[PDB]
Design a protein around this ligand. Structure first.
Ligand SMILES: [Cl-]
Ligand SMILES: [Cl-]
Ligand SMILES: [Cl-]
Ligand SMILES: [Cl-]
Ligand SMILES: [Cl-]
Ligand SMILES: [Cl-]
Ligand SMILES: [Cl-]
Ligand SMILES: [Cl-]
Ligand SMILES: [Cl-]
Ligand SMILES: [Cl-]
Ligand SMILES: [Cl-]
Length: 129
């Protein structure tokens, strides 16, 4: 499923991402935008045998189990396939665990490089949730 910007903003706000660990809603929309382009089926295999899954490109080395990553931890305690759902709950809950870890959203490189320090409120602008 390819969420629209505003449709995705409302789901993330509805899932309590707004100002979660101090990160306003635009940050999460922006991170989704440059991680996956709002696509819940987005995948990205790395050469180390890890793969990035779903709308926030969560990596199977640390966070989820795909059972084919020699890493590997499952710190969000979920299957990586749950992160490819058109329901964003599993991605959002795993994101909350990651962002709580003191790296914060710097965990997401696309957010560091594309979103961080920018006017992220732009992303929720023209939605009105
Ligand atoms: Cl919080
Ligand atoms: Cl914002
Ligand atoms: Cl865009
Ligand atoms: Cl894979
Ligand atoms: Cl994800
Ligand atoms: Cl192993
Ligand atoms: Cl590991
Ligand atoms: Cl699991
Ligand atoms: Cl969950
Ligand atoms: Cl930060
Ligand atoms: Cl605008």
């Amino acid at each position: 499923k390819v969420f629209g910007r505003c449709e995705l903003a409302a789901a993330m706000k509805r899932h309590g991402l707004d100002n979660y660990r101090g990160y306003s809603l635009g940050n999460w929309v922006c991170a989704a935008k440059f991680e996956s382009n709002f696509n819940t089926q987005a995948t990205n295999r790395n050469t180390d045998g890890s793969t990035d899954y779903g709308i926030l490109q969560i990596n199977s080395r640390w966070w989820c189990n795909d059972g084919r990553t020699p890493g590997s931890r499952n710190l969000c305690n979920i299957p990586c396939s749950a992160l490819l759902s058109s329901d964003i709950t599993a991605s959002v809950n795993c994101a909350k665990k990651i962002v709580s870890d003191g790296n914060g959203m710097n965990a997401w490189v696309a957010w560091r490089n594309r979103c961080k320090g920018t006017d992220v409120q732009a992303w929720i602008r023209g939605c009105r949730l």
